[PDB]
Symmetry: C2
Subunit: 243 residues, 2 copies
Amino acid sequence: GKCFVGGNWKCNGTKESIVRLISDLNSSKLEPDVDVVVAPPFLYIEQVKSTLTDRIEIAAQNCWIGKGGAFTGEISAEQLKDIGCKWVILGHSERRHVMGENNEFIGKKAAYASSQGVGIIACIGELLEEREARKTFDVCFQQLKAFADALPSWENVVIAYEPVWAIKVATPEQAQEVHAAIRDWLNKNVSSEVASETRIIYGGSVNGSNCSELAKKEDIDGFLVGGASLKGPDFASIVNSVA
Amino acid sequence: GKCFVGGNWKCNGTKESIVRLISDLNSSKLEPDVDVVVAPPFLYIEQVKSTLTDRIEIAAQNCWIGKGGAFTGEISAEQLKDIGCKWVILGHSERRHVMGENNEFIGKKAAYASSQGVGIIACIGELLEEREARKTFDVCFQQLKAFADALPSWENVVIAYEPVWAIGTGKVATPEQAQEVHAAIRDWLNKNVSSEVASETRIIYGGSVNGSNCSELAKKEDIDGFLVGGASLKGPDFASIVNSVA
């Protein structure tokens, strides 16, 4: 098994800014035993695939619930396959909470994307109001079950825990607390082999100056990086922290 | 005062299929003095921009309500401007009725994309039940109002009337029915915005347009062109639709 670091560029970047980011990612020294993924906005995925080192695999940030057709504005998983993505981010907190995506909806995307041979970065996490109600685990478990009930296999799936409730700062102990509970849930509700093989990555706010103490935690297998992924040096330091 | 014909490819296409569609579009002869636009899925916009005749301008099919940032999965209007789009489709019936976009949400996108210098294809239209209740105009007028209240300028705005019962159903509106609504839209613009906006703004018909039925629709006084769904995926068919509006 290998640790996993994904860079979610979110809704950011231009042709010019992405040339510079690709330049700095290409010149980075990245340790070889980490799986590295970046997720550009749809428009720029071809430019990234063409000029970024093939040591880094490419993810998209979303897809539609089913095959293509009369869904203006949407991108299908078979199109993600066609353009060269190996991964798609599903259930990101911003799509759940700004954009209203519910669990059944996200579950349909996971079933369909995996059916097209695209890996899933499956995002889960609870709001501040839910943690306060002592429902951290109820919410994360309900979200995991929706992925589990839809997926044909866990082989090409990574789980990202997003402490949405922080937005204070989550401690490495609070992060590890959830990652352990997630891995336990897999053990009890899927299998022992899935529980040990599935990477569980931390998706709270992470940069090159706070990743090292999170990386030491037993059930933190890497990171889903937000804003720090827009800068080569910061991102490379996060990659190298889990090597 | 030019007619306007847009092709909405929707969620369709691969590199390979789009090569074939681009080849067919490049090989057609398009009558001059028609604004022609195609809307590829986000992934393929660069490939289209690079290899499709620059006679045809490029649209995107959606964008976010405001500037970029922490909006995973979304494309901002300044990114559309960066990549070479001159138009974005907003308020398409599929985003309203399948994906839940409401009038105010759509209006925010329209205002923001306009602020980035991207043209608007503003879609309105009524459901089968609403036409059955004789609310066609109520609904269309409310949808126009939401665009008019949000838009800080009507430069580079085109209105697309899509009778939702006609999208992908093969039940095209008759030329008489379409003309009736287009006339009402233009009168609404005359009364509620300005007579300059009313006479200048292209009002295009969407809903099962194909190479057969475009000629009689194009004859109507207030139908200024088309927003083409399924037929835009076939190069020769789309070219005959462009050529109908001369």
